[PDB]
Amino acid sequence: SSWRDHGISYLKYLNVCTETLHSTVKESRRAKYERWSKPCYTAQRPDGAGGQETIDKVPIHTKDY
Amino acid sequence: VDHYNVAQDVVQMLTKYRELQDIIAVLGIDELSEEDKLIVDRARKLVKFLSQPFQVAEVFTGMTGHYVQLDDTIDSFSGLLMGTYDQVPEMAFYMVGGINSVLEKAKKMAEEAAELEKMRRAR
Amino acid sequence: VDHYNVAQDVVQMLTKYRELQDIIAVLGIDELSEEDKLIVDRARKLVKFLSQPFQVAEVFTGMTGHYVQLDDTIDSFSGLLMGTYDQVPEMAFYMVGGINSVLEKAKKMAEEAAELEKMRRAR
Amino acid sequence: VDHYNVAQDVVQMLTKYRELQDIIAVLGIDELSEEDKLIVDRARKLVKFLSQPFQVAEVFTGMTGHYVQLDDTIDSFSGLLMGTYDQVPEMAFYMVGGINSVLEKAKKMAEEAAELEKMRRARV
Amino acid sequence: ADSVGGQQVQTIPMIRGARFVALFNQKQPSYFMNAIVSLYACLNGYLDDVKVQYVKFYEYLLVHRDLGIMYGTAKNKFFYMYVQELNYLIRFFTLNSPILHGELEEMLKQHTHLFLQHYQSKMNAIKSEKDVKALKNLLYSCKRAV
Amino acid sequence: SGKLRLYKEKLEGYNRFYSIVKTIKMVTLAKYRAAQGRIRTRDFSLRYTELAFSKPQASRDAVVAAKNALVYIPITTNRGSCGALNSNIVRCIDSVVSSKMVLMPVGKRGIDSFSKLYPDEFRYGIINDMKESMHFGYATFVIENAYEVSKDADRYQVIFNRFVSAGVQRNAVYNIPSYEKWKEDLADAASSDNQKNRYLFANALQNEEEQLIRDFFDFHAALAVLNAVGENELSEQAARLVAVEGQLTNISSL
Amino acid sequence: HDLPEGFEFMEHKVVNKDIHAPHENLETLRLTLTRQDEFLLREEPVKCVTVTGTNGEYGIYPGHAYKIVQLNPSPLTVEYTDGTTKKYFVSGGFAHINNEGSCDVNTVECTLLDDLDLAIAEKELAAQQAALGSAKDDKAKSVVEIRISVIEAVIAALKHH
Ligand SMILES: O=c1ccn([C@@H]2O[C@H](COP(=O)(O)OP(=O)(O)OP(=O)(O)O)[C@@H](O)[C@H]2O)c(=O)[nH]1
């Protein structure tokens, strides 16, 4: 609705909806469904020193959208 | 010649059974093909069928022992390999002597379970 | 009793560290539990904290020796085991005496590190 | 000087390969660094290259013997170290003479592959 | 042997195996009654809810103390750990006998309930710089006292 | 005697190695048995994603013709000891070296290799903690990063591993033609008789609005990734259970 | 080096019908329902399927014209020829309808309506409403509105039956 005007892409909209749907699942099945949303990942580039400089091209969590 | 052939077949089946044990404990029992399942069942019967009650242990273990003649041994194992005794329960071969003992113990098991059904059906 | 308990705890940890050293070789230190890593960190500090420069080996080492009192050793090693000195750099425990000398090398280590950072910052 | 420098270089890599071979035995080749694999490949080619069929062992080897000149050996091993022959198959260095023999066995091997791919196409 | 480099699964065999290994730690020889009773308690799962670190303290209280008498809850008529002459009765009559089985289970159940209710509850609530050391000294003393 | 002492130490040391690795096999055996459920529950999700980006095409014209950035998103594990799965991917990338080629790999061990073997064709890579079943959000993050790396990218090529049977693992590729040129090809599929399988499907997309088409393109492109990353995991556990048995028949020989 | 295309592994291609072909009267529709790359139904013959797209609801029956639908968070119904109804709830995705008699509904998340709970939705709705007032910026407000709308749709579906 109003998220398009703010530049939010459709894929991010899908991720938020799925996360909300998982949060609405019962406790028993939440053990499985909630695993299908948790964004446990990052984006890194190795630098000269070897440190994995983290990138900020795209937010990882929904709250960062 | 028959004795040698039977012995080799048993050894081959046992070796295959060990290989199938590794697979079922890796991919799952359901992953075995139809032939493999039959081999597993026959091999397990062979392993159970290799145990014998010794007459020396009658006093301690109570169960009467058995002296299996060689002629019976070859025929008993030869029949099992072919698949004639594919309907006998596995446990009927455990600590029995000869093919006839396998059959009598099957009667005593089938008849024993008959009472259990009439009980569980009733009550 | 404190001396006995501390000594036993030190030896037990260094026995565990030997086992975990193998897993760190087959697998990596990134595949260990959150408690195993803590044992590894403290154990590595214990190994280095046992070193001591002797007053007679100044030529060999080039540094003045230390004479550590009995009570200082018991207190210092007990603190490392319970996690008190967990934020101290590991190398601050190498070739030092009591914890008071560990903390002075850490400050010296931190100051030089700050100087290096300042030099890098100007570049 | 070239003879000494090349000979030393060969032994240096044959020493590197022995150390690497200890890692390779347990874990495997895939558990090596990117440059380590290059060293392994060159060393393996060196090991194969050192072999030579003698004129007296024709019966056992079933192949005509070779007599490699000193200059040819030095120049041939120099290239293999430089990487100039990194595109030649490994088995082209086995039981050969100089680099000329290497580059001919490679040709025959490639041609024989055409009798295994053209035949494959005919079968298909 | 199959969980050296992975998180273990807390099954009944492992829950009791760990206690058995812990119980074997001892400095002085144990009287037969004390040893057999402690093994029986661990064998039937009375120590499943007891942490491995507190096993020695639990055994010490069972042997050298009596929680039931302390809180006025003991109901057994004769089976008490302070009666050192029960050893020969246990030797003659196994613990799995109607003469002693009924009271043995009652004592173990009551002792376990009291220990969990009073002692282990306070242990899990220790948050200080001196209490932690005092608890550590206690456990070490129990390790080499029983 | 020292020599006897040395050999005895070596033997037990190798025994300790066989034990720490026998455990790994049991672990990766579980992560593969549980992960074998996908084979029965797959191959129908992407049916219409075929009609989108299933363009049987040559490997030369598609490469030379493009003059804009060609994004590549190889998938790699973040841990070693998985056959040659991670190794073959690098070889495939090397065979497709080009001026416009760019790499945005996945995994710690993919970052380790592509970073140094292609310094001139590297922007950054993604990593995934394997405590989560590969989910859509992870795929979206990869897609969003790929677009920002090169929005004016001719194509995005994802190279992952496919698991046919328990031991037959191959390398597979998903091509995602950039929307701008996908719209142009959807035009030919709607008018010319050429492209008959994609005539109806193309027309239905045309009848709808453009935003829906853009959402469609992003959705199935993301869904394609959800198969790419999701499938490589299954191949990973296969190789890590095929080269952890090869490491246990070499320890037993030593 | 002929990289096998990933789609080639999937031999279950889509059956598209030519325009000029003669008509066939179909009595069943092949439904293919997918969640997060996991299908729940494999070309299952059904009598009809009801799907709530953006513009409105759609009742797809065999022979429905070829179309593409952009779904919205809502329930989905499947009625078999036997006379049995099965209801899921989807959070989004696309539905492809083919004139040949196939309908592929690939959703990001498709879960049984039974698995959902009412009280959980109510408390979550209240929390989102409370957080909406404290929204950090416009983007947060839109996100909360999206979450609220999904919850309201779930509650409405549950209260319907
Ligand atoms: O102003 C406009 C114009 C067109 N459209 C959209 O463009 C498309 C034009 O396409 P059609 O004219 O074929 O619509 P339709 O009859 O299939 O519509 P439905 O019953 O399926 O809803 C339809 O999807 C319409 O909603 C708008 O949304 N707004």
For ligand 1, the distance from its centroid to the CA atom of residue F140, given in whole angstroms, is 28
**Of E65, E142, E146, nearest in space to E107 by CA:** E65
Q: Whose CA is nearest to atom 3 of ligand 1?
A: F209
Pairing of strands G110-112, G85-90: antiparallel
Phi/psi for E9 (5° steps) reads: -105, 125
H or E segment to which residue G70 belongs: strand G67-79
Is there a binding annotation on residue G58? yes
Question: Angle F108-117/D34-50 helices, nearest 10 degrees?
Answer: 70
Residues 6+ apart with CB under 8 A from A38: F131, F132, F135
- Check if F200 contacts A (Cβ < 8 Å): no
3-state secondary structure at position G46: strand
- Three-state SS across D28-91? CHHHCCHHHHHHHHHHHHHHHHHCCCCCCCHHHHCCCCCCCCHHHHHHHHHHHHHCCCCCCCHH
Rounded CA-CA distance C114/C119 in Å is: 9
Residues F190 and F205 sit within 8 Å (Cβ to Cβ): no
Pairing of strands G39-46, F125-128: unpaired
Residues E40 and E95 sit within 8 Å (Cβ to Cβ): yes
Residues G34 and G106 sit within 8 Å (Cβ to Cβ): yes
**Hey, what are G107's tokens?**
């959703």
H or E segment to which residue G110 belongs: strand G110-112
Beta strands in chain F (DSSP E): 69-72, 101-103, 125-128, 153-163, 169-177
Q: Which residue of F has its CA nearest to A56?
A: F145
Rounded CA-CA distance D70/D72 in Å is: 6
Residue A52, burial from CB neighbour count under 10 angstroms (0-12, 13-18, 19+): middle
**What Å distances lie between residue E131 and B101, C71, E126, E134, CA to CA?**
71, 21, 6, 5
Chain G residues whose beta carbon lies within 8 Å of the beta carbon of residue F171? 3-4
Task: Determine whether the interchain pair F148/A18 forms a contact, defined as Cβ–Cβ distance below 8 Å.
Answer: no
Pairing of strands G102-107, G29-35: parallel
Rounded CA-CA distance F228/G56 in Å is: 33
Q: Supply the DSSP symbol for A6.
A: G
> How far, in whole angstroms, is CA B15 from its chain's centroid?
17
Q: Which residue of F has its CA nearest to D25?
A: F250
A to G CB pairs, distance under 8 Å:
80
3-state secondary structure at position F157: strand
Residues F185 and F209 sit within 8 Å (Cβ to Cβ): no
Residue D78, burial from CB neighbour count under 10 angstroms (0-12, 13-18, 19+): middle
> How far, in whole angstroms, is CA G140 from its chain's centroid?
26
Residue with tokens 């698991």: F163
Rounded CA-CA distance F202/F188 in Å is: 9
Residues 6+ apart with CB under 8 A from C105: C91, C92, C96
Rounded CA-CA distance C99/F91 in Å is: 54
E to F CB pairs, distance under 8 Å:
14
Residue F125, burial from CB neighbour count under 10 angstroms (0-12, 13-18, 19+): buried
3-state secondary structure at position F36: helix
Q: What angle do CA C68, C71, C72 make, to 5 degrees?
A: 50
For ligand 1, the distance from its centroid to the CA atom of residue F208, given in whole angstroms, is 7
Rounded CA-CA distance B47/B75 in Å is: 16
Query: Any residues with Cβ below 6 Å from ligand 1, and which?
Result: F 207-209; G 55
Pairing of strands F125-128, A41-46: antiparallel
- Check if C31 contacts E (Cβ < 8 Å): yes
**Hey, what are F87's tokens?**
């190794």
**Hey, what are A48's tokens?**
């000269």
Residue F239, burial from CB neighbour count under 10 angstroms (0-12, 13-18, 19+): buried
Residues E35 and E5 sit within 8 Å (Cβ to Cβ): no
Rounded CA-CA distance A60/G109 in Å is: 19
Taking residue G103's Cβ as centre, other Cβ atoms within 10 Å add up to 25
Task: Determine whether the interchain pair A21/G111 forms a contact, defined as Cβ–Cβ distance below 8 Å.
Answer: yes
**Hey, what are F44's tokens?**
């129908």
Residues F161 and F143 sit within 8 Å (Cβ to Cβ): no
Residues B37 and B9 sit within 8 Å (Cβ to Cβ): no
Exposure on the CB side of residue F95, measured as CA atoms within 13 A: 12
Dihedral of CA atoms E55, E59, E62, E64 in degrees, nearest 10, equals -140
Q: Chains meeting D at 3+ CB pairs closer than 8 A?
A: F
The total number of residues shown for chain D amounts to 124
**Hey, what are D59's tokens?**
């019966």
Give C29→chain E minimum CA distance, Å: 11
Q: What angle do CA B109, B110, B116 make, to 5 degrees?
A: 90
Rounded CA-CA distance B89/B109 in Å is: 9
Residues G110 and G76 sit within 8 Å (Cβ to Cβ): yes
Q: Which residue of A has its CA nearest to F140?
A: A11
> Which domains occur in chain F, in start order?
31-240 (3.40.1380.10)
**What Å distances lie between residue A34 and E10, F134, G36, G57, CA to CA?**
25, 12, 13, 29
Give G146→chain A minimum CA distance, Å: 7
The total number of residues shown for chain G amounts to 161
Residues 6+ apart with CB under 8 A from G73: A17, A21, G89, G90, G91, G92, G149, G150, G153, G154
Buried (b) or exposed (e) across D43-61, using 16+ Cβ within 10 A?
Answer: bebbebbeebbeeeeeeee
Residues D82 and D56 sit within 8 Å (Cβ to Cβ): no
Q: Chains meeting A at 3+ CB pairs closer than 8 A?
A: F, G
Rounded CA-CA distance F25/F46 in Å is: 32
**What Å distances lie between residue G105 and D74, F135, G91, G154, CA to CA?**
70, 18, 12, 19
Residues 6+ apart with CB under 8 A from G122: G155
Radius of gyration of chain F (CA): 22
Residue with tokens 């022995």: D18
Report the DSSP beta bridge partners of residue E71: none
Residues 6+ apart with CB under 8 A from G5: F54, F56, F172, F173, F174, F175
Rounded CA-CA distance C41/G1 in Å is: 48
**Hey, what are F98's tokens?**
């080009």
Q: Experimental method for this entry? A: cryo-EM
Task: Determine whether the interchain pair F84/D25 forms a contact, defined as Cβ–Cβ distance below 8 Å.
Answer: no
Task: Determine whether the interchain pair G5/F203 forms a contact, defined as Cβ–Cβ distance below 8 Å.
Answer: no
Rounded CA-CA distance D78/E28 in Å is: 75
Task: Determine whether the interchain pair A37/F219 forms a contact, defined as Cβ–Cβ distance below 8 Å.
Answer: no
Rounded CA-CA distance A39/E51 in Å is: 35
Residues C81 and C42 sit within 8 Å (Cβ to Cβ): yes
For ligand 1, the distance from its centroid to the CA atom of residue B74, given in whole angstroms, is 83
Give F9→chain C minimum CA distance, Å: 14
**What Å distances lie between residue F53 and C121, D46, F71, F226, G8, CA to CA?**
50, 47, 16, 15, 12
Q: Chains meeting F at 3+ CB pairs closer than 8 A?
A: A, B, C, D, E, G
Is there a binding annotation on residue G88? no
Torsion D41-D43-D48-D52 (CA) sign: positive
Residues A23 and F148 sit within 8 Å (Cβ to Cβ): no
Residues B79 and B6 sit within 8 Å (Cβ to Cβ): no
Residues G125 and G148 sit within 8 Å (Cβ to Cβ): yes
Left if phi > 0, otherwise alpha if psi is -120 to 50, otherwise beta: which for C95?
A: left
Torsion B7-B11-B13-B14 (CA) sign: positive
Buried (b) or exposed (e) across B69-91, using 16+ Cβ within 10 A?
Answer: eeebbeebbbebbeeebeebeee
Residues 6+ apart with CB under 8 A from F13: none
Question: Angle E98-114/E32-43 helices, nearest 10 degrees?
Answer: 70
Residues A36 and A42 sit within 8 Å (Cβ to Cβ): no
